[model samples]
Target: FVNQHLCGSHLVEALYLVCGXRGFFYTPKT
Candidate 1:
């Protein structure tokens, strides 16, 4: 499953909406 915390940003949210499943699967490790 995708991490919710990683989606905590306007840019990320937008990306998630635009990228859909692909963006949800992408997570930064920093």
Candidate 2:
């Protein structure tokens, strides 16, 4: 998977472990 995102659909933007235990990073727009 491309950054654990090579698969899934447009509705697969769950979340990424930004920099902590419960952090999020929604870059490049949603």
Candidate 3:
């Protein structure tokens, strides 16, 4: 179970990196 959780976290990090590389900047829109 621990390994599965670690894998999921890694996947999320990878996605965030890809998003960052693609210029997906975050800003507050209210």
Candidate 4:
């Protein structure tokens, strides 16, 4: 359970970054 919780926390953080930037690493064609 501890390991799973840690993984979930990281996933949430990653999602936050992605959404926060509106796919800063994606949606580009330049």
Candidate 5:
């Protein structure tokens, strides 16, 4: 799996909607 770092603006609109907070960051698996 590939590791990635993503933030609100870099995420999909719907994903950001669910996330609710823009200050947070996350690692995604692919």
Candidate 6:
């Protein structure tokens, strides 16, 4: 996904952590 879309999805979670939302930074890949 693109940043624009990702921001709404993963980035929300990612940015949350940057600002102290979730714990994990990057998600695990299979």
Per-prediction TM-score to the true structure, in the order listed: 0.38, 0.21, 0.45, 0.49, 0.28, 0.34
Clashing pairs in 4: none
lDDT per residue (tens digit) for residues 1-30 in model 2:
255345433423444433456765454546
Candidate 1 least-lDDT 10 residues = 21-30
Better of 4 and 5 by TM-score: 4
lDDT of each: 0.66, 0.46, 0.63, 0.63, 0.55, 0.60
How high is the lDDT of residue 11 in model 3?
70
| Model 6, TM vs. native | 0.34
Candidate 5 residue spans exceeding 4 A from truth: 1-11, 22-30
Best by lDDT: 1
Alpha carbon deviation, residue 11, candidate 2 (Å)? 5.6
| lDDT (Cα) of model 1 | 0.66
Which tens-of-lDDT digit does each residue in 1-30 have in candidate 6? 445655568665657768774355545456
Better of 3 and 5 by lDDT: 3
Screening candidate 6 with a backbone cut-off below 3 angstroms (N, C-alpha, C), the clashing residue pairs are: 16-21
lDDT of 4: 0.63
* Model 5 steric clash total: 0
Q: How many clashes in each candidate? A: 0, 1, 0, 0, 0, 1
lDDT of 5 by residue, 1-30 (tens): 643344434566556677787544554566
